[PDB]
Protein backbone atom coordinates (compact mmCIF):
# COMPACT_ATOMS: atom_id res chain seq x y z
CA UNK A 1 0.00 0.00 0.00
CA UNK A 2 2.73 2.46 -1.04
CA UNK A 3 0.16 5.11 -2.06
CA UNK A 4 -1.51 5.31 1.37
CA UNK A 5 -0.49 8.96 1.57
CA UNK A 6 -2.50 10.05 -1.47
CA UNK A 7 -5.85 10.42 0.25
CA UNK A 8 -4.75 9.43 3.75
CA UNK A 9 -5.91 11.20 6.90
CA UNK A 10 -3.12 12.41 9.22
CA UNK A 11 -3.54 13.60 12.82
CA UNK A 12 -1.28 16.50 13.80
CA UNK A 13 0.16 16.28 17.29
CA UNK A 14 1.79 19.33 18.86
CA UNK A 15 4.04 17.52 21.37
CA UNK A 16 4.35 20.34 23.91
CA UNK A 17 0.58 20.32 24.42
CA UNK A 18 -0.47 16.68 23.99
CA UNK A 19 0.43 14.85 27.24
CA UNK A 20 2.98 15.57 29.97
CA UNK A 21 4.15 12.18 31.28
CA UNK A 22 7.29 13.58 32.92
CA UNK A 23 5.87 16.28 35.20
CA UNK A 24 7.37 19.62 34.17
CA UNK A 25 4.22 20.99 32.58
CA UNK A 26 5.36 20.37 28.99
CA UNK A 27 4.03 17.56 26.81
CA UNK A 28 6.56 14.91 25.82
CA UNK A 29 7.15 11.85 23.66
CA UNK A 30 6.23 9.22 26.23
CA UNK A 31 2.94 11.08 26.72
CA UNK A 32 2.21 10.61 23.01
CA UNK A 33 3.15 6.93 23.15
CA UNK A 34 0.75 6.41 26.05
CA UNK A 35 -2.12 7.87 23.99
CA UNK A 36 -1.45 6.19 20.62
CA UNK A 37 -4.38 3.83 21.24
CA UNK A 38 -6.63 6.86 21.45
CA UNK A 39 -5.16 8.22 18.22
CA UNK A 40 -5.70 4.88 16.45
CA UNK A 41 -9.30 4.88 17.72
CA UNK A 42 -9.94 8.01 15.66
CA UNK A 43 -9.59 5.88 12.49
CA UNK A 44 -6.90 8.17 11.15
CA UNK A 45 -4.11 6.67 9.06
CA UNK A 46 -1.13 8.33 10.68
CA UNK A 47 0.29 11.16 12.71
CA UNK A 48 2.44 14.21 12.03
CA UNK A 49 4.57 15.36 14.99
CA UNK A 50 5.48 19.01 15.28
CA UNK A 51 9.17 19.45 16.22
CA UNK A 52 10.62 17.57 19.18
CA UNK A 53 14.29 18.17 18.28
CA UNK A 54 16.88 19.90 20.43
CA UNK A 55 15.81 23.54 20.59
CA UNK A 56 16.10 26.65 22.80
CA UNK A 57 12.28 26.83 22.31
CA UNK A 58 12.25 30.49 21.32
CA UNK A 59 9.81 29.48 18.57
CA UNK A 60 8.78 26.43 20.58
CA UNK A 61 10.68 23.84 18.61
CA UNK A 62 10.87 25.49 15.18
CA UNK A 63 14.28 26.88 16.17
CA UNK A 64 16.39 23.72 15.95
CA UNK A 65 19.89 23.33 17.40
CA UNK A 66 20.36 19.59 16.72
CA UNK A 67 18.50 17.99 13.83
CA UNK A 68 19.33 14.43 14.87
CA UNK A 69 18.36 14.42 18.51
CA UNK A 70 15.36 14.89 20.81
CA UNK A 71 15.18 17.86 23.15
CA UNK A 72 15.65 16.73 26.76
CA UNK A 73 12.28 18.18 27.79
CA UNK A 74 10.58 15.79 25.35
CA UNK A 75 12.65 12.76 26.33
CA UNK A 76 15.26 10.90 24.28
CA UNK A 77 15.86 9.42 20.84
CA UNK A 78 15.01 6.00 22.31
CA UNK A 79 11.64 7.42 23.40
CA UNK A 80 11.07 8.43 19.80
CA UNK A 81 12.05 4.97 18.52
CA UNK A 82 9.56 3.46 20.98
CA UNK A 83 6.82 5.86 19.83
CA UNK A 84 7.51 4.86 16.22
CA UNK A 85 7.41 1.13 17.00
CA UNK A 86 4.12 1.43 18.92
CA UNK A 87 2.48 3.56 16.25
CA UNK A 88 3.47 1.01 13.61
CA UNK A 89 2.11 -1.80 15.76
CA UNK A 90 -1.27 0.00 15.66
CA UNK A 91 -1.12 0.50 11.89
CA UNK A 92 -0.34 4.22 12.14
CA UNK A 93 2.15 5.96 9.87
CA UNK A 94 4.47 8.44 11.58
CA UNK A 95 5.52 11.66 9.91
CA UNK A 96 7.71 14.30 11.54
CA UNK A 97 8.36 17.97 10.96
CA UNK A 98 11.57 18.82 9.20
CA UNK A 99 12.58 22.41 9.73
CA UNK A 100 15.24 22.82 7.06
CA UNK A 101 14.69 26.44 6.04
CA UNK A 102 16.50 27.80 9.10
CA UNK A 103 18.30 26.74 12.26
CA UNK A 104 18.51 28.12 15.77
CA UNK A 105 21.34 30.60 16.20
CA UNK A 106 22.54 28.05 18.79
CA UNK A 107 22.97 25.44 16.07
CA UNK A 108 26.71 24.66 15.76
CA UNK A 109 26.54 25.45 12.02
CA UNK A 110 25.56 29.04 12.80
CA UNK A 111 27.91 29.36 15.75
CA UNK A 112 30.68 28.50 13.30
CA UNK A 113 29.35 30.49 10.33
CA UNK A 114 28.99 33.77 12.23
CA UNK A 115 32.58 33.94 13.52
CA UNK A 116 34.05 35.57 10.40
CA UNK A 117 33.60 35.69 6.61
CA UNK A 118 36.13 32.98 5.85
CA UNK A 119 35.39 29.87 7.94
CA UNK A 120 34.18 26.60 6.32
CA UNK A 121 30.56 27.40 7.11
CA UNK A 122 30.71 31.08 6.16
CA UNK A 123 28.35 30.56 3.21
CA UNK A 124 25.90 28.13 4.87
CA UNK A 125 23.69 31.02 5.97
CA UNK A 126 22.59 34.14 4.14
CA UNK A 127 25.07 36.93 4.81
CA UNK A 128 25.19 40.32 3.11
CA UNK A 129 27.04 43.59 3.47
CA UNK A 130 25.14 46.59 4.82
CA UNK A 131 24.11 49.32 2.39
CA UNK A 132 26.66 52.18 2.36
CA UNK A 133 24.53 53.89 5.05
CA UNK A 134 24.81 50.88 7.39
CA UNK A 135 21.19 49.71 6.91
CA UNK A 136 19.92 46.24 5.82
CA UNK A 137 20.54 45.05 2.25
CA UNK A 138 16.89 45.36 1.21
CA UNK A 139 13.27 45.82 2.30
CA UNK A 140 12.47 42.24 3.34
CA UNK A 141 10.61 41.93 6.63
CA UNK A 142 10.56 39.24 9.25
CA UNK A 143 7.13 37.68 9.71
CA UNK A 144 7.70 38.00 13.46
CA UNK A 145 8.46 41.73 13.27
CA UNK A 146 11.14 44.13 12.09
CA UNK A 147 13.66 43.71 9.30
CA UNK A 148 14.38 40.20 8.03
CA UNK A 149 18.04 41.17 8.50
CA UNK A 150 20.06 41.37 11.73
CA UNK A 151 23.57 42.84 11.98
CA UNK A 152 26.34 40.67 13.41
CA UNK A 153 29.42 42.56 14.61
CA UNK A 154 31.77 39.59 14.11
CA UNK A 155 31.39 39.77 10.33
CA UNK A 156 30.16 43.35 9.95
CA UNK A 157 27.36 41.85 7.86
CA UNK A 158 23.64 41.19 8.19
CA UNK A 159 22.18 37.69 8.19
CA UNK A 160 18.72 36.80 6.90
CA UNK A 161 15.89 35.47 9.07
CA UNK A 162 12.35 35.21 7.76
CA UNK A 163 11.32 34.45 11.34
CA UNK A 164 13.00 35.20 14.70
CA UNK A 165 16.39 36.88 14.94
CA UNK A 166 17.39 33.56 16.51
CA UNK A 167 16.29 31.64 13.40
CA UNK A 168 18.94 32.37 10.73
CA UNK A 169 17.94 31.09 7.28
CA UNK A 170 20.01 28.39 5.65
CA UNK A 171 21.59 29.41 2.32
CA UNK A 172 20.17 26.93 -0.17
CA UNK A 173 22.35 28.47 -2.87
CA UNK A 174 25.24 26.71 -1.14
CA UNK A 175 25.27 23.07 -2.34
CA UNK A 176 26.93 21.63 0.78
CA UNK A 177 24.21 23.20 2.94
CA UNK A 178 21.48 21.65 0.83
CA UNK A 179 23.19 18.28 1.01
CA UNK A 180 23.63 18.54 4.76
CA UNK A 181 19.87 19.04 5.08
CA UNK A 182 19.14 16.03 2.87
CA UNK A 183 21.56 14.00 5.01
CA UNK A 184 19.68 15.09 8.14
CA UNK A 185 16.44 13.92 6.57
CA UNK A 186 18.06 10.61 5.59
CA UNK A 187 18.98 10.06 9.26
CA UNK A 188 15.27 9.93 10.11
CA UNK A 189 14.39 7.89 7.04
CA UNK A 190 16.96 5.32 8.17
CA UNK A 191 15.17 5.12 11.53
CA UNK A 192 11.97 4.13 9.68
CA UNK A 193 9.85 7.27 9.71
CA UNK A 194 7.07 7.26 7.14
CA UNK A 195 7.57 10.78 5.94
CA UNK A 196 7.94 14.46 6.66
CA UNK A 197 5.99 17.67 7.03
CA UNK A 198 8.23 20.29 5.41
CA UNK A 199 8.07 23.61 7.22
CA UNK A 200 7.82 26.74 5.01
CA UNK A 201 8.68 24.63 2.00
CA UNK A 202 8.60 27.40 -0.57
CA UNK A 203 10.92 29.62 1.52
CA UNK A 204 14.12 27.58 1.01
CA UNK A 205 15.61 29.80 -1.71
CA UNK A 206 15.75 33.60 -1.64
CA UNK A 207 16.80 35.82 -4.57
CA UNK A 208 20.62 35.92 -4.61
CA UNK A 209 20.41 39.42 -6.09
CA UNK A 210 18.61 40.51 -2.90
CA UNK A 211 16.03 42.55 -4.83
CA UNK A 212 13.43 44.67 -3.01
CA UNK A 213 9.87 43.41 -3.01
CA UNK A 214 7.20 45.63 -4.56
CA UNK A 215 4.35 46.94 -2.36
CA UNK A 216 0.84 45.53 -2.50
CA UNK A 217 -1.38 48.06 -4.33
CA UNK A 218 -4.06 49.68 -2.19
CA UNK A 219 -7.34 47.80 -2.39
CA UNK A 220 -5.74 44.43 -3.13
CA UNK A 221 -6.19 41.41 -0.86
CA UNK A 222 -3.45 40.53 1.61
CA UNK A 223 -1.75 37.15 1.94
CA UNK A 224 -3.68 34.38 3.70
CA UNK A 225 -0.68 33.41 5.81
CA UNK A 226 -0.35 36.46 8.09
CA UNK A 227 -2.66 38.81 10.01
CA UNK A 228 -3.47 42.08 8.29
CA UNK A 229 -2.00 44.00 11.26
CA UNK A 230 1.46 42.69 10.28
CA UNK A 231 3.66 44.97 8.08
CA UNK A 232 4.84 41.82 6.28
CA UNK A 233 1.49 41.98 4.48
CA UNK A 234 2.36 45.29 2.82
CA UNK A 235 4.70 43.58 0.34
CA UNK A 236 4.18 41.20 -2.52
CA UNK A 237 6.55 38.35 -1.73
CA UNK A 238 8.41 37.76 -4.96
CA UNK A 239 12.13 37.88 -4.18
CA UNK A 240 12.25 36.66 -0.57
CA UNK A 241 10.80 33.22 -1.32
CA UNK A 242 9.33 30.93 -3.99
CA UNK A 243 12.31 31.14 -6.32
CA UNK A 244 12.77 28.96 -9.42
CA UNK A 245 15.82 27.17 -7.96
CA UNK A 246 13.63 25.53 -5.35
CA UNK A 247 11.96 23.35 -7.99
CA UNK A 248 15.29 21.69 -8.68
CA UNK A 249 15.94 21.15 -4.99
CA UNK A 250 12.49 19.58 -4.57
CA UNK A 251 13.55 17.06 -7.20
CA UNK A 252 16.63 16.21 -5.13
CA UNK A 253 14.46 15.85 -2.03
CA UNK A 254 11.98 13.63 -3.88
CA UNK A 255 14.86 11.49 -5.14
CA UNK A 256 15.83 10.92 -1.51
CA UNK A 257 12.26 10.01 -0.55
CA UNK A 258 12.05 7.63 -3.53
CA UNK A 259 14.90 5.59 -2.03
CA UNK A 260 12.51 4.74 0.80
CA UNK A 261 9.36 3.26 -0.79
CA UNK A 262 6.13 4.13 0.99
CA UNK A 263 7.37 7.41 2.43
CA UNK A 264 5.76 10.79 1.80
CA UNK A 265 6.12 14.55 2.15
CA UNK A 266 3.59 17.27 2.91
CA UNK A 267 4.82 20.80 2.41
CA UNK A 268 3.56 23.89 4.25
CA UNK A 269 3.00 26.59 1.60
CA UNK A 270 3.21 30.26 2.55
CA UNK A 271 2.79 32.26 -0.64
CA UNK A 272 0.83 35.13 -2.20
CA UNK A 273 -0.75 32.60 -4.56
CA UNK A 274 -0.84 29.45 -2.45
CA UNK A 275 -3.07 27.17 -4.53
CA UNK A 276 -0.84 27.89 -7.52
CA UNK A 277 2.29 27.17 -5.48
CA UNK A 278 0.83 23.96 -4.06
CA UNK A 279 -0.18 22.78 -7.53
CA UNK A 280 3.27 23.58 -8.96
CA UNK A 281 5.12 21.94 -6.08
CA UNK A 282 3.09 18.71 -6.06
CA UNK A 283 2.86 18.14 -9.84
CA UNK A 284 5.06 16.05 -12.13
CA UNK A 285 5.48 13.08 -9.79
CA UNK A 286 9.02 14.26 -9.16
CA UNK A 287 8.72 16.84 -6.36
CA UNK A 288 6.44 17.03 -3.31
CA UNK A 289 3.88 14.30 -2.75
CA UNK A 290 1.39 16.77 -1.29
CA UNK A 291 1.14 20.20 0.35
CA UNK A 292 -1.27 22.32 2.36
CA UNK A 293 -2.12 25.99 2.04
CA UNK A 294 -3.84 28.64 4.12
CA UNK A 295 -6.89 28.75 1.82
CA UNK A 296 -8.93 26.78 4.39
CA UNK A 297 -7.02 28.18 7.38
CA UNK A 298 -8.43 31.71 7.24
CA UNK A 299 -11.75 33.47 7.80
CA UNK A 300 -13.90 32.62 4.77
CA UNK A 301 -15.86 29.39 5.15
CA UNK A 302 -19.14 29.51 3.22
CA UNK A 303 -20.24 26.89 0.71
CA UNK A 304 -19.64 29.52 -1.98
CA UNK A 305 -16.09 30.10 -0.77
CA UNK A 306 -15.34 26.38 -0.70
CA UNK A 307 -16.73 26.02 -4.23
CA UNK A 308 -14.46 28.88 -5.30
CA UNK A 309 -11.40 27.17 -3.84
CA UNK A 310 -12.31 23.90 -5.58
CA UNK A 311 -13.04 25.62 -8.90
CA UNK A 312 -9.71 27.45 -8.81
CA UNK A 313 -7.78 24.33 -7.89
CA UNK A 314 -9.45 22.34 -10.69
CA UNK A 315 -7.98 24.76 -13.24
CA UNK A 316 -4.42 24.06 -12.04
CA UNK A 317 -2.09 21.09 -12.63
CA UNK A 318 -4.11 17.90 -12.94
CA UNK A 319 -1.33 15.92 -11.27
CA UNK A 320 -1.21 18.11 -8.17
CA UNK A 321 -2.32 16.60 -4.88
CA UNK A 322 -3.55 18.71 -1.96
CA UNK A 323 -3.57 18.08 1.73
CA UNK A 324 -6.54 19.91 3.25
CA UNK A 325 -6.45 21.25 6.79
CA UNK A 326 -8.87 23.46 8.70
CA UNK A 327 -6.73 23.78 11.85
CA UNK A 328 -3.12 23.59 12.97
CA UNK A 329 -0.75 25.02 15.59
CA UNK A 330 -0.45 28.34 13.67
CA UNK A 331 -4.10 29.44 13.40
CA UNK A 332 -7.24 29.97 15.47
CA UNK A 333 -9.00 26.66 16.14
CA UNK A 334 -11.57 26.01 13.40
CA UNK A 335 -14.52 25.66 15.79
CA UNK A 336 -13.97 29.34 16.57
CA UNK A 337 -12.27 30.67 13.42
CA UNK A 338 -15.04 29.31 11.19
CA UNK A 339 -17.67 28.37 13.76
CA UNK A 340 -17.84 31.24 16.28
CA UNK A 341 -21.26 32.33 15.02
CA UNK A 342 -22.59 28.80 14.55
CA UNK A 343 -23.94 26.16 16.93
CA UNK A 344 -20.86 25.04 18.89
CA UNK A 345 -21.87 21.40 18.98
CA UNK A 346 -23.43 20.85 15.56
CA UNK A 347 -21.22 22.99 13.35
CA UNK A 348 -17.87 21.23 13.84
CA UNK A 349 -19.54 17.92 12.89
CA UNK A 350 -20.63 19.12 9.44
CA UNK A 351 -17.39 21.08 8.92
CA UNK A 352 -15.42 17.90 9.51
CA UNK A 353 -17.72 15.93 7.22
CA UNK A 354 -16.81 18.46 4.51
CA UNK A 355 -13.07 18.26 5.27
CA UNK A 356 -13.22 14.45 5.14
CA UNK A 357 -15.12 14.56 1.81
CA UNK A 358 -12.88 16.92 -0.18
CA UNK A 359 -10.62 15.31 -2.79
CA UNK A 360 -7.23 15.13 -1.16
CA UNK A 361 -5.33 14.06 1.90
CA UNK A 362 -6.40 15.52 5.24
CA UNK A 363 -4.62 16.91 8.26
CA UNK A 364 -6.74 16.87 11.41
CA UNK A 365 -5.38 18.92 14.33
CA UNK A 366 -5.23 17.62 17.91
CA UNK A 367 -8.46 18.61 19.65
CA UNK A 368 -10.28 19.49 16.43
CA UNK A 369 -11.93 16.05 16.75
CA UNK A 370 -13.34 17.24 20.09
CA UNK A 371 -14.76 20.46 18.63
CA UNK A 372 -12.51 22.55 20.89
CA UNK A 373 -12.92 26.33 20.71
CA UNK A 374 -9.96 28.69 20.66
CA UNK A 375 -8.57 29.32 24.14
CA UNK A 376 -8.34 32.77 25.68
CA UNK A 377 -4.81 33.08 27.01
CA UNK A 378 -4.27 36.05 29.32
CA UNK A 379 -1.48 38.55 28.59
CA UNK A 380 0.64 37.36 31.52
CA UNK A 381 0.55 33.77 30.25
CA UNK A 382 1.49 34.53 26.64
CA UNK A 383 4.47 32.45 25.43
CA UNK A 384 4.57 32.75 21.64
CA UNK A 385 6.97 35.54 20.57
CA UNK A 386 4.49 36.20 17.74
CA UNK A 387 2.00 37.12 20.49
CA UNK A 388 4.22 39.93 21.80
CA UNK A 389 4.81 42.08 18.72
CA UNK A 390 1.35 43.15 17.53
CA UNK A 391 -0.61 42.92 20.81
CA UNK A 392 -3.58 43.34 21.12
CA UNK A 393 -4.44 43.58 17.41
CA UNK A 394 -2.88 40.14 16.94
CA UNK A 395 -2.38 37.93 19.99
CA UNK A 396 -0.16 35.19 18.59
CA UNK A 397 -0.84 31.48 18.37
CA UNK A 398 -1.06 30.37 21.99
CA UNK A 399 -4.85 30.10 21.77
CA UNK A 400 -4.60 26.90 19.69
CA UNK A 401 -1.68 25.50 21.71
CA UNK A 402 -3.26 25.08 25.13
CA UNK A 403 -3.04 21.57 26.59
CA UNK A 404 -5.26 18.72 25.42
CA UNK A 405 -8.16 17.91 27.77
CA UNK A 406 -7.89 14.20 28.53
CA UNK A 407 -10.23 14.44 31.50
CA UNK A 408 -12.46 16.98 33.24
CA UNK A 409 -10.23 16.99 36.32
CA UNK A 410 -7.23 18.99 37.50
CA UNK A 411 -5.34 20.37 34.48
CA UNK A 412 -7.54 18.12 32.35
CA UNK A 413 -5.24 15.24 33.23
CA UNK A 414 -2.56 16.86 31.06
CA UNK A 415 0.05 17.34 33.79
CA UNK A 416 0.50 17.05 37.57
CA UNK A 417 1.73 20.66 37.65
CA UNK A 418 0.66 23.98 36.11
CA UNK A 419 1.23 23.52 32.38
CA UNK A 420 3.30 25.80 30.16
CA UNK A 421 0.06 27.31 28.79
CA UNK A 422 -3.15 27.34 30.86
CA UNK A 423 -5.79 24.66 30.48
CA UNK A 424 -8.84 26.32 28.97
CA UNK A 425 -11.80 25.90 31.34
CA UNK A 426 -14.27 25.27 28.50
CA UNK A 427 -12.14 22.41 27.23
CA UNK A 428 -12.72 20.42 30.43
CA UNK A 429 -16.42 19.99 29.56
CA UNK A 430 -15.31 18.71 26.14
CA UNK A 431 -12.58 16.41 27.45
CA UNK A 432 -11.79 13.06 25.86
CA UNK A 433 -13.20 11.30 28.93
CA UNK A 434 -16.43 13.28 28.62
CA UNK A 435 -16.86 12.45 24.92
CA UNK A 436 -15.60 8.85 24.88
CA UNK A 437 -18.87 7.04 25.48
CA UNK A 438 -21.22 9.78 24.30
CA UNK A 439 -22.43 8.64 20.87
CA UNK A 440 -23.60 12.23 20.25
CA UNK A 441 -20.20 13.83 20.93
CA UNK A 442 -18.03 15.20 18.12
CA UNK A 443 -15.32 12.63 18.96
CA UNK A 444 -17.69 9.87 17.96
CA UNK A 445 -18.94 11.72 14.92
CA UNK A 446 -15.32 11.84 13.76
CA UNK A 447 -14.76 8.14 14.42
CA UNK A 448 -17.90 7.31 12.44
CA UNK A 449 -17.06 9.64 9.58
CA UNK A 450 -13.56 8.24 9.15
CA UNK A 451 -14.83 4.65 9.31
CA UNK A 452 -17.34 5.63 6.62
CA UNK A 453 -14.67 7.31 4.50
CA UNK A 454 -12.53 4.15 4.68
CA UNK A 455 -15.42 2.01 3.45
CA UNK A 456 -15.87 3.94 0.20
CA UNK A 457 -13.08 3.93 -2.40
CA UNK A 458 -14.54 7.09 -3.98
CA UNK A 459 -13.87 8.92 -0.70
CA UNK A 460 -10.19 7.98 -0.66
CA UNK A 461 -9.05 9.43 -3.98
CA UNK A 462 -12.10 9.65 -6.20
CA UNK A 463 -12.54 12.44 -8.71
CA UNK A 464 -14.63 15.37 -7.51
CA UNK A 465 -17.31 17.07 -9.61
CA UNK A 466 -19.20 20.06 -8.26
CA UNK A 467 -22.95 19.91 -8.75
CA UNK A 468 -25.61 22.60 -8.55
CA UNK A 469 -27.38 22.42 -5.20
CA UNK A 470 -27.80 26.18 -4.94
CA UNK A 471 -25.74 28.89 -3.28
CA UNK A 472 -26.15 27.87 0.36
CA UNK A 473 -25.35 24.18 0.04
CA UNK A 474 -22.06 22.53 -0.93
CA UNK A 475 -22.56 19.59 -3.24
CA UNK A 476 -20.36 17.35 -5.34
CA UNK A 477 -20.00 13.82 -6.58
CA UNK A 478 -17.00 11.64 -5.80
CA UNK A 479 -16.23 8.86 -8.27
CA UNK A 480 -13.85 5.93 -8.34
CA UNK A 481 -14.49 3.02 -10.67
CA UNK A 482 -18.01 1.64 -10.19
CA UNK A 483 -18.68 3.89 -7.19
CA UNK A 484 -20.16 7.36 -7.50
CA UNK A 485 -21.33 9.11 -4.35
CA UNK A 486 -23.28 12.34 -4.06
CA UNK A 487 -22.24 14.45 -1.07
CA UNK A 488 -24.31 17.44 0.04
CA UNK A 489 -23.56 19.66 3.02
CA UNK A 490 -25.56 22.28 4.87
CA UNK A 491 -22.98 24.36 6.70
CA UNK A 492 -25.65 26.83 7.86
CA UNK A 493 -27.88 27.05 10.91
CA UNK A 494 -31.10 26.95 8.86
CA UNK A 495 -32.87 24.13 7.03
CA UNK A 496 -32.29 23.99 3.25
CA UNK A 497 -34.16 22.10 0.57
CA UNK A 498 -32.94 21.36 -2.94
CA UNK A 499 -33.79 19.36 -6.04
CA UNK A 500 -31.01 16.82 -6.68
CA UNK A 501 -29.12 17.35 -9.95
CA UNK A 502 -28.35 13.64 -10.37
CA UNK A 503 -30.36 10.42 -9.99
CA UNK A 504 -29.93 8.70 -6.60
CA UNK A 505 -29.94 4.92 -6.11
CA UNK A 506 -29.78 4.81 -2.31
CA UNK A 507 -29.14 6.78 0.87
CA UNK A 508 -26.00 6.17 2.91
CA UNK A 509 -26.57 6.86 6.61
CA UNK A 510 -23.59 7.99 8.67
CA UNK A 511 -22.86 9.55 12.07
CA UNK A 512 -26.44 10.40 13.12
CA UNK A 513 -26.88 12.99 10.35
CA UNK A 514 -30.58 13.59 9.60
CA UNK A 515 -31.22 14.69 5.99
CA UNK A 516 -34.57 13.60 4.41
CA UNK A 517 -34.96 12.53 0.78
CA UNK A 518 -38.25 12.29 -1.11
CA UNK A 519 -37.36 11.30 -4.66
CA UNK A 520 -35.32 14.13 -6.17
CA UNK A 521 -36.05 16.47 -3.25
CA UNK A 522 -33.41 16.58 -0.52
CA UNK A 523 -34.11 18.38 2.76
CA UNK A 524 -31.13 19.15 5.01
CA UNK A 525 -31.80 20.46 8.51
CA UNK A 526 -29.29 22.90 10.00
CA UNK A 527 -25.73 21.57 9.98
CA UNK A 528 -26.54 18.26 8.31
CA UNK A 529 -24.49 16.27 5.78
CA UNK A 530 -26.05 13.83 3.31
CA UNK A 531 -24.36 11.03 1.36
CA UNK A 532 -26.04 9.06 -1.40
CA UNK A 533 -25.11 6.39 -3.93
CA UNK A 534 -25.61 7.73 -7.46
CA UNK A 535 -27.54 5.51 -9.88
O1 LIG B 1 9.59 27.76 11.57
C2 LIG B 1 8.97 29.01 11.79
C3 LIG B 1 7.50 28.82 11.52
O4 LIG B 1 7.47 27.76 10.60
C5 LIG B 1 6.21 27.26 10.27
C6 LIG B 1 5.65 26.65 11.53
O7 LIG B 1 4.47 26.00 11.16
C8 LIG B 1 5.46 27.76 12.56
O9 LIG B 1 4.94 27.25 13.77
C10 LIG B 1 6.81 28.42 12.82
O11 LIG B 1 6.71 29.56 13.62
MG1 LIG C 1 6.57 16.45 30.03
45 is in an annotated binding site: no
Q: Shortest CA distance to 26 belongs to which of 366, 404, 439, 397?
A: 404
- Give catalytic residue positions: 199, 259
53 CB near ligand 1 (under 6 Å): no
Task: In whole angstroms, give the CA distance from residue 399 to residue 14.
Answer: 13
Cα–Cα separations (whole angstroms), residue 34 to 402, 420, 422: 19, 20, 22
**CATH number of the domain residue 158 falls in:** 3.90.400.10
Q: Shortest CA distance to 358 belongs to which of 462, 510, 472, 509?
A: 462
Task: In whole angstroms, give the CA distance from residue 38 to residue 33.
Answer: 10
**415 and 524 in a common domain:** no
Query: Domain end: 406, 431, 462, which one?
Result: 462
Range of the domain at 518: 463-535
Instruction: Specify which residues 152 forms β-bridges with.
Output: 157
Distance 412 CA to ligand 1 centre (A): 27
The most distant pair of C-alpha atoms in the chain lies apart, rounded to whole Å, by 78
Q: Is the four-CA dihedral 491, 451, 479, 503 of positive or negative sign?
A: negative
162 CB near ligand 1 (under 6 Å): no
Distance 414 CA to ligand 2 centre (A): 9
Classified as helix, coil or strand, 470 is coil
- Contacting residues for 227 by C-beta, under 8 A, at least 6 apart: 233, 390, 393, 394
Which ranges constitute the DSSP H helices of 226-302?
245-258, 274-282
**409 and 291 in a common domain:** yes
Task: In whole angstroms, give the CA distance from residue 199 to residue 178.
Answer: 15
Classified as helix, coil or strand, 5 is coil
**285 and 197 in a common domain:** yes
Q: Which strand (E) or helix (H) includes residue 36?
A: helix 36-41
Query: Domain end: 462, 481, 515, which one?
Result: 462
Instruction: Specify which residues 498 forms β-bridges with.
Output: 522
166 CB near ligand 1 (under 6 Å): no
Experimental method reported for this structure: X-ray
Task: In whole angstroms, give the CA distance from residue 275 to residue 295.
Answer: 8
Domain count, the chain: 3
Task: In whole angstroms, give the CA distance from residue 204 to residue 201.
Answer: 6
Distance 166 CA to ligand 1 centre (A): 13
CB atoms within 10 A of CB 202: 25
276 near 284, Cβ under 8 Å? no
**382 and 267 in a common domain:** yes
**485 and 446 in a common domain:** no
Distance 62 CA to ligand 1 centre (A): 6
Classified as helix, coil or strand, 157 is strand
**325 and 313 in a common domain:** yes
Task: In whole angstroms, give the CA distance from residue 446 to residue 349.
Answer: 7
Task: In whole angstroms, give the CA distance from residue 381 to residue 373.
Answer: 18
Burial class (CB in 10 A: 0-12, 13-18, 19+), 350: buried
* Closest C-alpha residue for ligand 1 atom 9: 330
Query: Domain end: 174, 200, 230, which one?
Result: 174
**71 and 7 in a common domain:** yes
According to DSSP, the β-strands at 46-49 and 463-466 are unpaired
384 CB near ligand 1 (under 6 Å): no
**493 and 404 in a common domain:** no
Q: What is the dihedral of CA 83, 86, 87, 90, to 10 degrees?
A: -170
**296 and 386 in a common domain:** yes
Task: In whole angstroms, give the CA distance from residue 314 to residue 308.
Answer: 10
Task: In whole angstroms, give the CA distance from residue 216 to residue 179.
Answer: 35
**268 and 301 in a common domain:** yes
Calculate Rg over the CA atoms of the chain: 23
**Which ligand lies nearest to the CA atom of residue 97 in the structure?**
1
Task: In whole angstroms, give the CA distance from residue 348 to residue 337.
Answer: 11
129 is in an annotated binding site: no
* 37 alpha carbon, distance to own chain's centre: 22
Which is the closest atom of ligand 1 to the Cα of 62?
1
CB atoms within 10 A of CB 425: 11
194 is in an annotated binding site: no
CB atoms within 10 A of CB 438: 10
| For the chain, the helix, strand and coil percentages under 3-state DSSP, each to the nearest 5 | 30, 20, 55
What is the per-residue burial (b if ≥16 Cβ within 10 Å, else e) of 331-340? bbbbbbbbbe
**Backbone dihedral angles phi then psi of residue 239, each to the nearest 5 degrees:** -100, -20
Q: Shortest CA distance to 11 belongs to which of 480, 443, 378?
A: 443
Amino acid sequence: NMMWWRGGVIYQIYPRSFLDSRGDGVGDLNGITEKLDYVASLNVDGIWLSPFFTSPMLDFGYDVSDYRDVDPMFGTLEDFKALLEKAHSLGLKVMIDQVISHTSDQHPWFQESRQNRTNPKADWFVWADPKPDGTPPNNWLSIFGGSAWTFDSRRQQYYLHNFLTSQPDVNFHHPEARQAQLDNMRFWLDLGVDGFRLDTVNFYFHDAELRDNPPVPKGEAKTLGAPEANPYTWQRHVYDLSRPENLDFLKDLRALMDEYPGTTTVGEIGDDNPLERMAEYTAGGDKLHMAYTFDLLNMPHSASYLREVIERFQRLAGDAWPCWATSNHDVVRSATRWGADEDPHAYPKVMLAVLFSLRGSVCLYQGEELGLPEADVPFERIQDPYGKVLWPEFKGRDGCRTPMPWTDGEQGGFSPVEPWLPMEARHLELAVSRQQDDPNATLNTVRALLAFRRSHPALFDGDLSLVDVGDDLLGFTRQKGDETLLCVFNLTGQEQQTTLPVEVASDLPVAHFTATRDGSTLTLPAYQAAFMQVA
